[PDB]
């Protein structure tokens, strides 16, 4: 848990403090950033671990020390100090679990898609839109339906939705993946628990900085004679333009009309169109290569979250939580699942 992670951070702090005084390292800036993280973490760690060790010692020694009353009063004072130290350790964990980075402040795109069992997925994906809308209206987030493909017996097959504000992606990072469904559904007559799955993609903003300059100082413009037919004038004059980019290597050849300025206009518009095509193709490949890594095949396999409905259990594969509610979870209030994953993900 966090105690096994804090010890490795304290050992890395004690190693970096010894390596800093050895004076054998030329580069020191990354070592100074590591020492800054060490001064942020290991001081509160050495406070909280020593306070918890002294509290556990003063409790376990005075609990069975021949049933004394003065040792019991000393253990009560140590328990008050233990409550103060536990509040200080919770404040230190809340300070260490803070999203300082400005990439966490960005908006997001949620893509809830159906997996196994279409009818079940539709019921489930519509309820997950309901689940994150309930979650989103609690903190006052804006929910806009960008695209929603309907199912058969209700729900939706694919939902792509923008959520805007201040800090959507940094709070909803850990939701890309699969979701189990164990339910007794409304579409099933028999009444046997079934397994259904749904896949959720979480995408960041990535704001469009499009249309770089054409850079006529970087354009190589070759004005040479044209091939073909038509007149004496074509032979005398060039009437053909080839423009090549230096940083991308895009070549556009125009031999269309008589005047070169109509040809100049086409030989710049095709450059702009091919720049826009080659940049939007790379952007759509960068979207797809991340979506195929976040969204799996869609099967019933374990992908980080398992939800149990007839037993009353919510068990995730990372940070094995055992919350037996399923009623304060179905109507917003997803703090207890999301927060400790952040707390022991920012420990690394």
């Amino acid at each position: 848990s966090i105690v096994a992670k804090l010890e490795a951070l304290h050992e890395r702090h004690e190693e970096v403090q010894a390596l800093l005084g050895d004076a054998q390292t030329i580069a020191d800036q990354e070592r100074f950033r590591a020492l800054s993280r060490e001064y942020a973490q290991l001081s509160d760690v050495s406070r909280c671990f020593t306070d918890w060790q002294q509290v556990q010692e003063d409790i376990e020694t005075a609990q069975m020390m021949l049933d004394d009353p003065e040792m019991r009063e000393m253990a009560q004072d140590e328990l008050r100090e233990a409550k103060e130290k536990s509040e200080q350790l919770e404040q230190q964990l809340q300070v260490l679990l803070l999203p300082k980075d400005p990439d966490d402040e960005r908006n997001a795109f949620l893509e809830v898609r159906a997996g196994t069992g279409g009818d079940e997925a539709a019921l489930f994906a519509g309820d997950l839109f309901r689940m994150y809308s309930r979650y989103a209206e609690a903190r006052r987030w804006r929910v806009e339906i960008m695209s929603a493909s309907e199912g058969e017996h209700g729900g939706y097959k694919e939902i792509i939705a923008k959520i805007c504000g201040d800090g959507v992606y940094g709070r909803l990072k850990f939701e890309s993946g699969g979701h189990r469904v164990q339910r007794v559904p409304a579409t099933e007559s028999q009444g046997r628990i079934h397994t259904s799955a749904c896949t959720v993609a979480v995408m960041p903003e990535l704001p469009d900085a499009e249309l770089p300059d054409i850079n006529p100082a970087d354009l190589r413009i070759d004005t040479f004679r044209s091939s073909g037919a038509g007149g004496q004038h074509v032979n005398t004059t060039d009437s053909a333009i080839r423009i090549t980019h230096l940083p991308t290597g895009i070549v556009v050849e125009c031999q269309d009309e008589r005047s070169q300025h109509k040809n100049k206009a086409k030989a710049l518009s095709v450059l702009g169109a091919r720049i826009h095509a080659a940049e939007m193709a790379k952007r759509q490949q960068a979207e797809a290569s991340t979506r195929r890594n976040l969204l799996g095949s869609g099967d019933r396999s374990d992908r980080n979250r398992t939800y149990n409905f007839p037993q009353g259990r919510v068990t995730d594969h990372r940070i094995n939580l055992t919350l037996y509610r399923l009623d304060e979870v179905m109507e917003g209030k997803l703090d207890m699942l999301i927060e400790p994953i952040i707390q022991e993900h920012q420990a690394d």
């Binding site: 970096v16 800093l20 005084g21 004076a23 020492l35 060490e38 001064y39």
Partner: protein
Amino acid sequence: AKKVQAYVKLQVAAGMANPSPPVGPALGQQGVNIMEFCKAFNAKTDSIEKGLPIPVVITVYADRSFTFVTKTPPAAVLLKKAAGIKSGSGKPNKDKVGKISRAQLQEIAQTKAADMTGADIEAMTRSIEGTARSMGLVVED
């Protein structure tokens, strides 16, 4: 009294024994060992108080040791426990951070006169009060 050979005035608050992250190789750049700044550094720190940044002379000789006469800590680190607020300048005149009066800085000023150079107590007093005013503090005259 020889000239400038190897001495500088830099170390963090003296309550931290052997500060390896903050200063580190800057005290161990010469032939003086790191262990010289943990064992002999607290021979004067324990006399008065621990945790205050106090400069000391680092004139390095070739005889493996160094002589030192401890100086006075500045008013910048002194106006954290005797001023109330732990913050300082950055917005000096755009807003008022805190205020001390003349009767406190004037009383503290002659205690720091062992290292300061002044012909009168009032001159060093108004020097320290101007240095305190430079952090945006408004003296109550």
